[PDB]
Design a protein around this ligand. Sequence first.
Ligand SMILES: *[C@@H]1O[C@H](CO)[C@@H](O)[C@H](O)[C@H]1O[C@H]1C[C@](C)(N)[C@H](O)[C@H](C)O1
Ligand code: ZN
Length: 7
Amino acid sequence: XXNXXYX
Ligand SMILES: *[C@@H]1O[C@H](CO)[C@@H](O)[C@H](O)[C@H]1O[C@H]1C[C@](C)(N)[C@H](O)[C@H](C)O1
Ligand SMILES: [Zn+2]
């Protein structure tokens, strides 16, 4: 990944 969140 590499992006973040949270969903
Ligand atoms: C998510 O990123 C922030 C910014 O670098 C960190 O401070 C944080 O500790 C990090 O969360 C960890 C723990 C978690 C939420 N269980 C996940 O594994 C994420 C990817 O990494
Ligand atoms: Zn991931």
